[PDB]
Design a protein around this ligand. Sequence first.
Ligand SMILES: Oc1ccc2c(c1)sc1nncn12
Lengths: 195, 198
Amino acid sequence: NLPEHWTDMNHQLFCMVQLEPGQSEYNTIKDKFTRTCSSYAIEKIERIQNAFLWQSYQVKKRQMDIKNDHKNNERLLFHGTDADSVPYVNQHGFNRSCNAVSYGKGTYFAVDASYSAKDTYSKPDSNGRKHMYVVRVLTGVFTKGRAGLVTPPPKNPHNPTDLFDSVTNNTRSPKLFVVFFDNQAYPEYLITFTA
Amino acid sequence: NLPEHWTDMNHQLFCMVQLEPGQSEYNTIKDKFTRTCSSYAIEKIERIQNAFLWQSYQVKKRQMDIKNDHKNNERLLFHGTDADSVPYVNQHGFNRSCAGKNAVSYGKGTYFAVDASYSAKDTYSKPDSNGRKHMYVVRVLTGVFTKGRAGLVTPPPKNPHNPTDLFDSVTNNTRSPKLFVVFFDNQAYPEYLITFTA
Ligand SMILES: Oc1ccc2c(c1)sc1nncn12
C-alpha cells in the first residue's frame, strides 16, 4: 500500500527518484533545508522508494498510534551521513550498531538541517559533496536521554517494560531525537549539497 | 494476522498461555528439548502471544520469503536467558544491544542454538533464586547464512563488490550449524518459554 507521491517502479521494490527542481515536492523539501542551510548549494534531491523499509515503518507507526491512543507520533528530521553509508541507509535504513552518543546508543536525528550539516555528520567526500537525509521518525512520547541508554527509559519505574518511544536533549525545546529500534525511521529524501 | 489457535485476548496485545502435557503442542516442545536435555525436568511451557512482535516478525518473514528463492527461511531455535531478561523479551523480543558476548563469538548479535543443551548452560539460562532456569523456543529468520566472524555488527555481504546485499544470518559452521546470530530487530519471534530445573 505504497504512497501517492511515489512513481511506478516497474514491479521492483526499491528506487532512488531524482526530484525535478521548481516542482512542489522539491520546493517543500528544499524549503525545510534552506530554513537553516540557505548558505549551502543543493546539487540534487532524491525520493527514497524502499517498499520493505516503508512497510516495516508503517507497521510500527500503526502500533505506536494504538499504544499511545493518539496519532501525533511522527516528526520530520534530518540525518547527516558520510558517502560510504548512503547505499546502506537507502537499502536498510538506520542502524544503531553502526559520533558522540551523549543521550543514548540509538540513531541521532536533528530538528535543524544546520546540525546535520556539520562535517562530523555529513562528511564531505573527495569531490566536496555532503549528504543529508530527510527522515520520517516515530518520536512518539519522549523524555530527556542520558549517556549509556540502550533503550528509552520506562514511562513509570513501577512498569519497567512500558517505554518512552524516543529521547531528546531537551523536552521543552528539543533539537535532537534518539531512537533505539530498527524501523522507527523511514529515510524519505537524500539531499546532495555543498558548502 | 493473529493465528487462529491463539487463545482470545479480549482486545489485549499480550498474553502468556500455559500449555497442558499430553497436547501435541506441549509434547513436541518437550521432545525437542529432551532430545539433548534429558537430565533436566520441565516445570512448565507457556505460549507467548505478543500481537505487535508477531506482526513485525511476519512482515520480515514475508519480505525474506520474497527476497530469497523458495528458501526455508525460518528455523525453530533455543535461547537461554536470565529471569531478569524474561519480562523485556516477552514484551519487546530480542535486542542485540543487550546480547551477552558468546564464549565463541561469530558476531555482535543475538545468539540462538540448535540444541537445548547449549542454551541449558548456566552461563545462558542462569538459575534464578528458586533454582528455575528459563529457555525460549524461537522462530528465527536464518534465511541464507555464512560462517560468522567476531567483528560483525551486521551479517556480511554475499559479495564484497555489493556491500548492501547481505546474508540473513551467520552460523559457527555452515556444514553443521549449532548456533545462529541475527543482527536485526524482529528477525526472531519468542514463541514458547520453558521453565526448567535440575
Ligand atoms: O551525537 C550525535 C551523533 C550523530 C548525529 C548527531 C548527534 S545530530 C546528527 N545528524 N546526523 C547524524 N547525527
